[PDB]
Amino acid sequence: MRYDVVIAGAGPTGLMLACELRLAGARTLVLERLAEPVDFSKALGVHARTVELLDMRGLGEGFQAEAPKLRGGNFASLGVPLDFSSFDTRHPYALFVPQVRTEELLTGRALELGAELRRGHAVTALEQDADGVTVSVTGPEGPYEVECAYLVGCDGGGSTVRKLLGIDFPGQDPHMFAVIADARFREELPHGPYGVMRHDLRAWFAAFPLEPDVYRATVAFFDAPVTEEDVRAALTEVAGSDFGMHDVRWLSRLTDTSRQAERYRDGRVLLAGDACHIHLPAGGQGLNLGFQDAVNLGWKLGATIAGTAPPELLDTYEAERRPIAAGVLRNTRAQAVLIDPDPRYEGLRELMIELLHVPETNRYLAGLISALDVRYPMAGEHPLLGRRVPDLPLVTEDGTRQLSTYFHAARGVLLTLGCDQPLADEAAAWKDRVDLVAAEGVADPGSAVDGLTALLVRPDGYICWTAAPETGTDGLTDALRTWFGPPA
Amino acid sequence: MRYDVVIAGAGPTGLMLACELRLAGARTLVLERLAEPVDFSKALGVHARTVELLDMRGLGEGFQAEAPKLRGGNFASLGVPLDFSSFDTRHPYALFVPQVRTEELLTGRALELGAELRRGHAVTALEQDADGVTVSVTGPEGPYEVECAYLVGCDGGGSTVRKLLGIDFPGQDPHMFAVIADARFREELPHGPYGVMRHDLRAWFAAFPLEPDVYRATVAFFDRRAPVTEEDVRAALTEVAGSDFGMHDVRWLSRLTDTSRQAERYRDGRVLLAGDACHIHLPAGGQGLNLGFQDAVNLGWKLGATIAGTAPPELLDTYEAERRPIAAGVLRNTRAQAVLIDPDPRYEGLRELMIELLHVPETNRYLAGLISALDVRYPMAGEHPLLGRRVPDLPLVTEDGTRQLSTYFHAARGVLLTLGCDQPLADEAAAWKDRVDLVAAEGVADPGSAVDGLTALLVRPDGYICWTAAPETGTDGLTDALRTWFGPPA
Ligand SMILES: Cc1cc2nc3c(=O)[nH]c(=O)nc-3n(C[C@H](O)[C@H](O)[C@H](O)COP(=O)(O)OP(=O)(O)OC[C@H]3O[C@@H](n4cnc5c(N)ncnc54)[C@H](O)[C@@H]3O)c2cc1C
Ligand SMILES: Cc1cc2nc3c(=O)[nH]c(=O)nc-3n(C[C@H](O)[C@H](O)[C@H](O)COP(=O)(O)OP(=O)(O)OC[C@H]3O[C@@H](n4cnc5c(N)ncnc54)[C@H](O)[C@@H]3O)c2cc1C
């Protein structure tokens, strides 16, 4: 058995990667250790940038059905929300979607697209050479080996693949330990949403609702499986009461360990999601970071296997993604100190609350957390470069159409604004990789795109080239060659 | 011997207070423990707001002669300067002026103004009643007692007066212990500007040039009442860096901590506190001297008017109400810096996120306004946006050409600035002519001005605005503002 790509792990990163690779025509195999999907949710939502990418893929409507919209974001529980309304987006909020549902949506899509999913199959070894990768698998039908051009480790924080490769995972050892419980409580919870601060103990309890009458309770202590008795002991020792907790849906530990893989690639093997970055779950960023790693990698790897990509393209995945993960680790490492109730961090907490009240400071952190502000280094001076395209209302014949409906196939899009057509002929040699979207104009005059006549957008929604009337066609062919490969 | 005010301590807070009180006609006595002024400098400069206040008093030119202008400010040594150019000021910078020079300038002025300075005289006890204060003094000719209406403790962080009064000094215990030495080093200093990092030891050595070939050397240890000896600084240096680096020509030695405390109150009857006497914090961003100097400018005119018996009785109370939150803000930002300078790799994300935030213009401006004190806003029950803010040094167009607004504040009287041919304001303020000067201008020589939509402003002797009129508003509230800050009509 020979496949183009083998993916180890069917978490949200692996599943999105499988979808992206199928859009790019790669024969994909997804191997999942667990026999059945997990029954608890780690992540409780998706941020504004993930919603935009699901919209671009025509998956958005499926997630939004689970309606709850969080218009403000959390930054180290300081009481000053991260306002997402300040953004040029159709989704100025985070969506409350439990991971179990996110994974069910992505599984449906990956299967619909033709990705092969093998649940109960684990990767134990790997062998690499110039030609390909041979992966050692153990499944319910016994051990076997599968050949591929590329293997991707989407196997979580304890990633087997990362360790198999010998990739170092540098970072920081934890300074905090917490126990989590998704449970019901007979007694009434104290207000704090709920919780008890304990500066003396250097600990805190905090709870918030999941669904009516069910809470996620956390007990954090600063400087083996967790059992109900652990959570009850911890709850009693900090809040002073058991609270009559019953029917625990999930129990687990949590730490502020902060590590990133030294590299995201080692020959024909790549890492994505928790496999290349672990951090304190603060501000709800991991699933989104992993999902976005997949969207960046998927089209680049698919084009590499198709043999249409420039050889330096797959390398841009680590170059673009490492700083983004670095930024999540940086802000979470900052939050980890900020949540430590040690009175030593009071000036720091108070100065942060003040800075959070400064609009541009609030917007800078909101753009980080929501990922609406991700900027990749890109050739040129125009501000829009390396940035996402907004979901523009476009005017055409047969009415107005949203720019995101042109990205379902995960091809690049050359968006023209006006009667000028020497652009269509110059890009015709890339017609097989890029679609020309010829609009009369933008249905809204406000638009970040207004001074422009043309944009070249990558399959991930990131702009790589712009034309204004003065500029005219220059760098187009260069941008096409850089991101999509040689002409016809 | 009877004086209106007795000041304990001739540090920069005490000296500015003496100047201010003399402008307000108070017979002032300044008692200094040291026989001769100190030949070293703790502070190395003055921030933009202090320069504006020296300008208002006609002292500005004396400080600026010692030219070095620092257009950027430090924030926990993060490499991202606090840009002061973003401010509507004539001094968008900090001045490099060593404390010895600042004190020499203020002493010259206080003496010129007739304040009595007694060097080698220390306050040991105090007795207070409804009528006044009796202060116990020990000087070179022996002990004595002096009577006054008010005593002010400007006696530093270890303030004798604060302790005499029983005022609690709440705050936080140190987490950092460091030694400072202004010295010359025979050996070459390693790159840090200069210094050695020691994560294992959870300490660091740092140094920066004071003048060519002279450095301020700091050895900090994270997580010592006795005065530092030269050997102590050599030991600290040697523990961290392996060597003392040929240390000689020791100008100064000192201990330093991140102890962060503020006096529960700034007043206890007829006794007041100002400067280090009511607030200690980690010296980070160079804020203490400026905070103390600004406490003096706020207190001086209010106390002088109280002794003159022209002030409303609730005026002296506005000193603590206005100053406490300002000092609270310095302690807050310095408590934040104290963590940021701790070498534990645990604070890396925090340091890195702060550098990023410092690159956000409005975040940079918010901290720059804090540190420079250009953004100090006092609560005014009133609702116009300039209320409680400083007046910019406006170029004024008048008869006899253009004149700067700061040249009208030399006497430390209030100023009623009018911008227009409308004179129903001069008659309405005539009963306060003895406390407030009418500055009648044709307009502002600059279109930019924060004052552009206004026709009139009432400014306190400290340069803080307390009343405004726009063409629509007209005269409403002048008499109330005059009564609130200057007292009843004459
Ligand atoms: C308490 C908590 C709350 C969080 N809240 C949020 C939030 O609100 N928002 C957010 O964005 N993120 C949040 N996160 C982070 C988020 O849950 C993760 O970042 C996300 O699950 C990572 O997805 P993944 O696919 O990379 O890895 P995983 O989800 O860990 O899945 C990897 C998969 O690989 C499989 N596997 C492992 N070893 C092998 C092997 N040898 N062979 C084959 N398969 C293997 C595993 O069975 C697993 O299914 C939270 C995390 C925690 C702990
Ligand atoms: C290392 C270091 C660097 C600094 N850098 C800066 C900087 O660049 N910028 C800045 O703005 N600030 C800086 N500061 C802070 C600044 O030096 C102080 O805040 C400032 O000196 C306070 O002035 P003061 O008049 O309140 O108190 P002090 O300067 O301490 O003087 C109080 C005076 O009272 C006298 N006295 C004490 N007891 C008695 C008594 N019983 N009777 C009579 N007199 C008495 C003392 O002799 C002394 O002269 C720094 C401080 C340090 C330690």
Swiss-Prot record, chain A:
Cofactor(s) this protein cannot do without: FAD
Disulphide bonds in the chain: none
GO molecular function terms noted in the UniProt entry: anhydrotetracycline monooxygenase activity; FAD binding
Protein's UniProt keywords contain Membrane: no
Known EC number: 1.14.13.234, 1.14.13.38
Keywords on record: Antibiotic biosynthesis, FAD, Flavoprotein, Monooxygenase, NADP, Nucleotide-binding, Oxidoreductase
Pathway participation: Antibiotic biosynthesis; oxytetracycline biosynthesis
Catalytic activity: 5a,11a-dehydrotetracycline + NADPH + O2 + H(+) = 5a,11a-dehydrooxytetracycline + NADP(+) + H2O; anhydrotetracycline + NADPH + O2 + H(+) = 5a,11a-dehydrotetracycline + NADP(+) + H2O
Co-factor remark: Binds 1 FAD per subunit.
SUPFAM superfamilies reported in the protein's UniProt record: FAD/NAD(P)-binding domain
Pfam families to which the protein is assigned, alphabetical: FAD_binding_3, Rng_hyd_C
Domain of life assignment: Bacteria
PANTHER family per UniProt: BINDING MONOOXYGENASE, PUTATIVE (JCVI)-RELATED (PTHR43004:SF19), TRK SYSTEM POTASSIUM UPTAKE PROTEIN (PTHR43004)
Function: Involved in the biosynthesis of the antibiotics oxytetracycline and tetracycline. OxyS starts by catalyzing the stereospecific hydroxylation of anhydrotetracycline at C(6) position to yield 5a,11a-dehydrotetracycline (12-dehydrotetracycline). If the released product is captured by OxyR, it is reduced to tetracycline. However, if the released product is recaptured by OxyS, it performs an additional hydroxylation at C(5), producing 5a,11a-dehydrooxytetracycline, which, following the action of OxyR becomes oxytetracycline.
Subunit: Monomer.
Record protein name field: 12-dehydrotetracycline 5-monooxygenase/anhydrotetracycline 6-monooxygenase
Phylogenetic classification of the source organism: Bacteria, Bacillati, Actinomycetota, Actinomycetes, Kitasatosporales
